[PDB]
């Protein structure tokens, strides 16, 4: 149904602005809010239908100590949204405490938007893990949202902070945030900073301006993830029906994404399926094996070729995953959007549950434990101090993420009747 | 056609013959001969260019005379279960399934519904029928494709026994390396080589026999431009192939079949034995050396 | 326009229509619309298209609508959740299969021949042959979505596996489900293996 | 079936680079990996079929202390291969010991490539005998490959070090390498340095830059040896079927090669058969007699003329070999490649087993024994010392090569029912 977006963190507000700009360009919308002259397709999930058919984006921007919001302010696209949903230290506990005291008015804004919406389906989160101000306050808001609304869905888009080092206290912050994400979120879309950075340095020749490109990448991914809802077909035109297949168990809810063209500015679907199963098209980094794989195709498709392609790729066994049970690949189809020039119009997406990200989490589990053992890297922050004088919440999150890694490695085994 | 254009001229000549008092065979003959050239030429003109007759001939060479050895090797590599008696209720579908599945690994992502494999052993029942455009070709008949199926079977036999033999050669890989290999009981006079020669030489001979006729046909067709002459060339091509591959019932054909049976039996001996061991192998080996020595002399009658 | 719209008004939008019926009054459903076994269906046919579109065509179309309603019922009913972990595994065992079945009936049949059929009716030159191509569309889509005959080996199998979807929905004892499911699943594959041959598209799954 | 290539030694990596460049030029391949615009022929043995039909060469480069690999690195043809298959003293025992400690990860790379390949047929080796670093490590890898894979084929392309002197310890190294090649290899393709050097000084007027030309020569020879597999006919489109005729006995597995044009930039097949039987077209140096001869022809051939040519050359008796048994010449045919300008399009190759190379081996057996007898040429190398304090492995290899020469000379006799 109707989904409200929340955006917080500097990179999160960047990709939210880019996402809304991308959808305004994608649909028949002017940057004033007015419907375009040449506008069939649904805008009834993320866009409020206002008085002059003004598709006002259903978005709530949360920030504290604004810097980039001023750059949002002086824009022609500052008249598309902001019906006054904008509300004005780099520690987790700092942002937690600051969000604690102003929980009421921002929750009042959320309830205001819930009253403004006729229906409700979910709150999708734009998040940056260990982004400083975004950390802690984002976990706090996630806990509040799970508390107040036990009937709605929570989706999280976030990047995982790895740049091969910087901040000595960020693994603690990301560990607490991951503990909150495991318990207080329903489904998590995971992203890696170094992987997207490497792809940006790969297909292009940039080294510094990675933000401006990665915004485009995440915007394309997120819009692709929502296209079958935005452009109505009839397979999984609800969020919940899509998410139900992707989550095999409530302990594994992290989703790996790709994108079939690394650059799209006339191959068949058979080729790009083979491309997508190659890991260079995969944008998120014993044997690691998928549990369940889904793919979504949008382009110029012949309907017989997808069947024979599934036959041939099935027989070729390019799906290097061994499950513990009956779970298999799932196909889906979406519409190519108008008004956008696309060479090689076939474009696909993948949503798969893969165990390999456990190793990435294990990297942080190694790092944090190392800095815990030497104990010269907690640095004695005061917000961390009165929030927890004994710092046993870090031990609690360490317990949870250990259980999580064990659940991962039990899922790697060909039986999940045994647990980890 | 240009027959419709020159229709009235042939009609004028026929009316002239209707007008004449005298019945002369010589004139009537000339009229018929004059019509016949154009009539054959139009079919020639269409069939070479627009129905792509030569392109189909390439496929015929590929799949009937086994000009594509690559697929019909991996076909045997992935299927060895038509050496046991088919029930012809499940295997019939299965062999065609395995054929196209083997083909899918590389090369032919377009048709291959046109070849049909039918089991009427299972390598002595496997046939092949290629679907041709029936309105667009009358050169091809059921009988022509049947003869193609015959030579297809005969070519299958030799590659089948040879593949087993050459695959069984693992002497230089396993048996000799790191192993001293007892001899003068577990000698076999290196007869693996001796058995290999008489079939491999035959393979080379068959290569020349097929390739010569296929070259001659593809040369002749471009020169002549009438369908009758094309018919002569094609009906000569088949007749050369049959007799030269010794498909005509001769005692030489029986000798060649006996050689193939000997090789097939020899594979069974060397398969089970594996590296150095005595399993009363000498009993079959004695029979084999006697039969081969007797059969080799018949080739000395074929040589003279 | 009428022909395309008709199969868009049954066989998205109708998912919202059925979710209301998931949780009586037949006029209630109309008002909910306008902004598992049994049901009644109705829609008016205007006369200039009623000389091509048949009344009995609505019946054939209605049957596969009922089947599709059962399919979406199964999809949504097992989509009610996201030691006692044991039920999860019975979830994936069942929710996959009905999904895979849904992929076959819907896209491979109701979208292949459906996309073909519009291109066919735009090529007719006469009122008469338009009826013939239409009825020869109906009779074959009534065979592909098999409802005519040999239905005592297939449709009873689909019904009996849907009874498991009823049982699990109540269940959210347990051991008695897989014993049935593996058995009737083996029935399905052992019949559909050589037995028109398009049924192989679920015999390999 | 599918063959993986391994390349080690400086000259071996040179000819591997030249070989892959030659096949990229030969087939419809761009030096980026992309299929050419005008591309029927098989590339499914040495080229992995990647995502954009990228015929990525199935090659593993093995090196230690890289120098020429840096020159490989800065090349437009450094994007054809290297999907990271490159992994970074001149004694046999030094390279043996160094390969000993890092056997595991390179074997892991080999197993990785074996998993990457669907089928497998053989590991073809680019080797330089007594090339310093290549010696010892190459023998070690050959022993490892024979151990781990008893079901696959091993082909060795290598040059034999003779430049008429230089290094006083290289006959020892080449003798140990020859002992390993006799026992741990399935078929050996032998090359001579002075012979190819003499031909290069013959047809051209060079004295120093022999490497750059000899790369071309070996590349042409090796590609010719594989053309009927690369360009599909139907006679011996497997390696094993070709190798089965060439090896008459597991003790004689060294193959003499030629090349019918000494320079090819309209004679008939009859002439060039007579040319090929002249030893000036043969590129590898009582009576010495062939055991079995094979030839491969690629060009503009009339199929009747080859028969009558075989008649006339048979009657002329230009085949100066006396066997002990029934073995004879074998003919084969291959396709002339497109996209390459060739004047005098008829080009042939010969594969024959000839006893004369025994004398060359005997030359080394004389030399090593001489330096063993004076004992001032072992030089007391330390790698040689702790590897073998008594240096009886050299005696072991001397025993084996003596048995080999005796097997050669027993094969020279008109009975091989007696052994040597």
Curated annotation (Swiss-Prot), chains A, D:
GO molecular function: GTP binding; identical protein binding; microtubule nucleator activity; structural constituent of cytoskeleton
Family label: Belongs to the tubulin family.
Modification after translation (UniProt): Phosphorylation at Ser-119 by BRSK1 regulates centrosome duplication, possibly by mediating relocation of gamma-tubulin and its associated proteins from the cytoplasm to the centrosome.
Top-level taxonomic group: Eukaryota
Clinical disorder: Cortical dysplasia, complex, with other brain malformations 4: A disorder of aberrant neuronal migration and disturbed axonal guidance. Clinical features include early-onset seizures, microcephaly, spastic tetraplegia, and various malformations of cortical development, such as agyria, posterior or frontal pachygyria, thick cortex, and subcortical band heterotopia and thin corpus callosum in some patients.
Phosphoserine found at: 119
Gene Ontology biological process: cytoplasmic microtubule organization; meiotic spindle organization; microtubule cytoskeleton organization; microtubule nucleation; mitotic cell cycle; mitotic sister chromatid segregation; mitotic spindle organization
Signal peptide (UniProt feature, chain positions): none
Functional description taken from the UniProt entry: Tubulin is the major constituent of microtubules, protein filaments consisting of alpha- and beta-tubulin heterodimers. Gamma-tubulin is a key component of the gamma-tubulin ring complex (gTuRC) which mediates microtubule nucleation. The gTuRC regulates the minus-end nucleation of alpha-beta tubulin heterodimers that grow into microtubule protafilaments, a critical step in centrosome duplication and spindle formation.
Family matches, as SUPFAM superfamilies: Tubulin C-terminal domain-like (SSF55307), Tubulin nucleotide-binding domain-like (SSF52490)
Ranges in a coiled coil: none
UniProt keyword annotation of Lipid biosynthesis present: no
Name of the protein this chain belongs to: Tubulin gamma-1 chain
GO cellular component labels: apical part of cell; cell leading edge; centriole; centrosome; ciliary basal body; condensed nuclear chromosome; cytoplasm; cytoplasmic microtubule
Annotated binding of GTP, by residue: 130-136
From Swiss-Prot, chain B:
Entry's Gene Ontology BP terms: cytoplasmic microtubule organization; meiotic cell cycle; microtubule nucleation; mitotic cell cycle; protein-containing complex assembly; spindle assembly
Subcellular compartments: Cytoplasm, Cytoskeleton, Microtubule organizing center, Centrosome
Main location class: cytoplasm
GO molecular function: gamma-tubulin binding; structural constituent of cytoskeleton
Tissue specificity annotation: Ubiquitously expressed.
UniProt GO cellular component terms: centrosome; cytosol; gamma-tubulin complex; gamma-tubulin ring complex; membrane; microtubule; microtubule cytoskeleton; recycling endosome
Transmembrane segments: none
Alphabetic keyword roster: Cytoplasm, Cytoskeleton, Intellectual disability, Microtubule, Primary microcephaly
Subunit and interaction comment: Component of the gamma-tubulin ring complex (gTuRC) consisting of TUBGCP2, TUBGCP3, TUBGCP4, TUBGCP5 and TUBGCP6 and gamma-tubulin TUBG1 or TUBG2. TUBGCP2, TUBGCP3, TUBGCP4, TUBGCP5 and TUBGCP6 assemble in a 5:5:2:1:1 stoichiometry; each is associated with a gamma-tubulin, thereby arranging 14 gamma-tubulins in a helical manner. Gamma-tubulin at the first position is blocked by TUBGCP3 at the last position, allowing 13 protafilaments to grow into a microtubule.
Illness: Microcephaly and chorioretinopathy, autosomal recessive, 3: A disorder characterized by congenital microcephaly and chorioretinal dysplasia associated with poor vision and nystagmus. Variable ocular anomalies include microphthalmia, retinal folding, retinal detachment, optic nerve hypoplasia, absence of retinal vessels, round areas of chorioretinal atrophy, and attenuated electroretinogram. Most patients have mild developmental delay and mild learning difficulties.
Family: Belongs to the TUBGCP family.
Official protein name in the record: Gamma-tubulin complex component 4
Organism of derivation: Homo sapiens
From Swiss-Prot, chain C:
Tissue localization of expression: Widely expressed, with highest levels in heart and skeletal muscle and moderate levels in brain.
Cell compartment(s), UniProt: Cytoplasm, Cytoskeleton, Microtubule organizing center, Centrosome
Annotated family: Belongs to the TUBGCP family.
Subunit (UniProt): Component of the gamma-tubulin ring complex (gTuRC) consisting of TUBGCP2, TUBGCP3, TUBGCP4, TUBGCP5 and TUBGCP6 and gamma-tubulin TUBG1 or TUBG2. TUBGCP2, TUBGCP3, TUBGCP4, TUBGCP5 and TUBGCP6 assemble in a 5:5:2:1:1 stoichiometry; each is associated with a gamma-tubulin, thereby arranging 14 gamma-tubulins in a helical manner. Gamma-tubulin at the first position is blocked by TUBGCP3 at the last position, allowing 13 protafilaments to grow into a microtubule.
Job description of the protein: Component of the gamma-tubulin ring complex (gTuRC) which mediates microtubule nucleation. The gTuRC regulates the minus-end nucleation of alpha-beta tubulin heterodimers that grow into microtubule protafilaments, a critical step in centrosome duplication and spindle formation.
Descriptive protein name: Gamma-tubulin complex component 5
Gene: TUBGCP5
Range covered out of full length: 718 to 1016 of 1024
